[PDB]
Amino acid sequence: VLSPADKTNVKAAWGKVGAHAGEYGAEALERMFLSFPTTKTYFPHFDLSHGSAQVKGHGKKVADALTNAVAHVDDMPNALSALSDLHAHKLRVDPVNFKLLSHCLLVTLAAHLPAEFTPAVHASLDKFLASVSTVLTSKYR
Amino acid sequence: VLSPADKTNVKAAWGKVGAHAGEYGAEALERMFLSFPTTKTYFPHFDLSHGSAQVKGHGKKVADALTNAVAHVDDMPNALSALSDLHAHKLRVDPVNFKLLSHCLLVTLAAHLPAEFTPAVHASLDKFLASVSTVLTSKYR
Amino acid sequence: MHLTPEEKSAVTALWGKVNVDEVGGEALGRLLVVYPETQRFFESFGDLSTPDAVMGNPKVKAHGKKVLGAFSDGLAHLDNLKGTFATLSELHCDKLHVDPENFRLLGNVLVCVLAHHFGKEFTPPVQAAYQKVVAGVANALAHKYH
Amino acid sequence: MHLTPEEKSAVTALWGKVNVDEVGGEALGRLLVVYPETQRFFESFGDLSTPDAVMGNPKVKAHGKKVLGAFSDGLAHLDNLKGTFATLSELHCDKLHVDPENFRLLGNVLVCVLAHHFGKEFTPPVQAAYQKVVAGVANALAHKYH
């Protein structure tokens, strides 16, 4: 469960991401597809080449849902109900993949935000991405 | 989340287990140590020979805790609170291991309860062991 | 795939008593009932809304038979699982887009079906040898993903 | 280690620039803070109640250097990781009782550490090659478990 300082750590780190959210989400996707090619099985309709507009577009979407989760950190299951339904009843992504995307987002943030990615903030981002993932797979069966 | 049908299914199945729980718990452990040897790293202080008494004894305790969870299926997080603290603060067992014990319990039940281990029940039981594992693992960080 | 001769004999001995058609149907059907997310790949199979609909669905039964037949053929080539399944691996990746994690779920469901059918005879040591075999098959089916 | 020439080259060049003392200390420190359960093996190191304590703990720093040193030497044996880490695998299993799943965690923390230090230079292709090496090392360290 996210503690107060965790929420504080996440709001601040995400705060600094700012207008670069979309770019980072796309980068994290690209890192995931290259590092973990099994994740590509979920996107056979996408052009997966470097810098493709589908990845960019999707990167923005993910990044925006994350902003919404940070803004709604105290009430995630409710702010994400529609995405949770979407992943459970339509997309049906195996849960292991959420850990691969979460790791790639961390690597992306660590790379863009050196001063801000302290040991304690790393800890908090990891718990946050983990909670978001739990929320997104909670209606699976 | 367990559904009404799931609860019914778990109570019926566990009821048939009855006064064999202990014996089935020990068997699930033996199965786990032999199929997934990395799990032994958590029991360096035990004698792990076939028929070992520490194994039997520990089998009974695991089985008693599952029985208690079936008896409080509408209040598992509180019924298992003590165990959750134990696993988080002292034992600190990596979560993947819970999936391995759960599979071996399922295998053990399938081997001894042919008439009861129908598809619907297998499904409800797998969900039940997953909820128990989530509770035991909920306070890790 | 480090199998010992006594593991290999245990696996083969038992498999000799398996009706692949029937076990194939039980395993595929149980996969779809216990892990409903795997139904994403079989929408052309019709009604999969309840357990009876899945288990008695003739298309599930026929596909189960095909899956387990390929698996049997692999038990006859334990020393070259990768070569044996190479073309199937490519197929599952490039044409069917199946996340290999699904092969691991099926493996474990199969082990529950084997225990269910054989009871006592599926001892801890026999199960351990089958766990190595299902992991080996899953690894071989994932080997050509790219 | 199905590493590509362009991938072996990517790993090696980046590594030539690594301060092993700093990175080892930071990776082992981050591991204990991000995944507190791992503190179970390090009770004798002192105070690990807070991130500042963990990161400053001189035994944590020193053990990090030793771990990353063994890792370095493995990067020169990429064609035979198993052979290189065999003894270390036996010791992690027989004397230290470390669940190999912890090796994967350290691997990922390490990768985050490399990105944190190298920024732009730690590009997607470079990361992918490092993920292959870190899984490779984890698998060789787990190889002699019984």
Ligand code: HEM
């Ligand atoms: C932090 C975790 C994740 C979040 C916040 C997230 C969020 C989203 C969002 C916002 C959408 C778009 C929904 C819309 O169109 O309105 C989406 C769709 C989708 N996501 Fe998830 N996602 C996550 C993880 C994953 C992972 C792990 C996978 C599998 C690798 C995945 C696969 C997909 C797919 C295939 C789509 C549909 C893409 C399309 O057809 O355009 N997602 N997700």
Ligand code: HEM
């Ligand atoms: C279904 C999931 C599990 C349940 C219900 C369960 C239940 C219990 C119980 C009742 C105890 C005894 C605590 C006491 O003496 O009061 C215990 C202890 C213990 N458990 Fe868990 N356990 C589960 C899974 C696991 C797994 C996956 C592991 C690691 C492989 C594990 C490792 C241990 C260890 C090492 C002890 C201490 C044993 C001793 O020193 O005597 N448990 N558990």
Ligand code: HEM
């Ligand atoms: C033991 C592992 C498996 C083996 C040996 C296996 C084998 C096969 C074979 C022989 C075919 C027919 C190939 C063809 O049409 O040319 C097939 C097709 C297929 N497999 Fe796999 N399979 C396995 C696991 C799985 C799993 C776990 C899934 C998904 C959860 C899956 C999804 C599919 C799908 C969707 C088809 C095509 C069905 C159709 O004709 O519409 N397979 N498999």
Ligand code: HEM
């Ligand atoms: C990158 C993977 C790892 C490598 C290469 C590695 C390597 C080493 C080496 C070379 C030693 C020194 C042994 C000696 O002096 O004979 C050591 C000790 C040790 N390692 Fe590992 N290690 C790794 C990961 C881990 C992790 C993940 C854990 C647990 C979280 C761990 C726990 C230990 C412990 C408890 C010792 C003994 C420390 C002491 O002297 O008190 N190691 N390791």
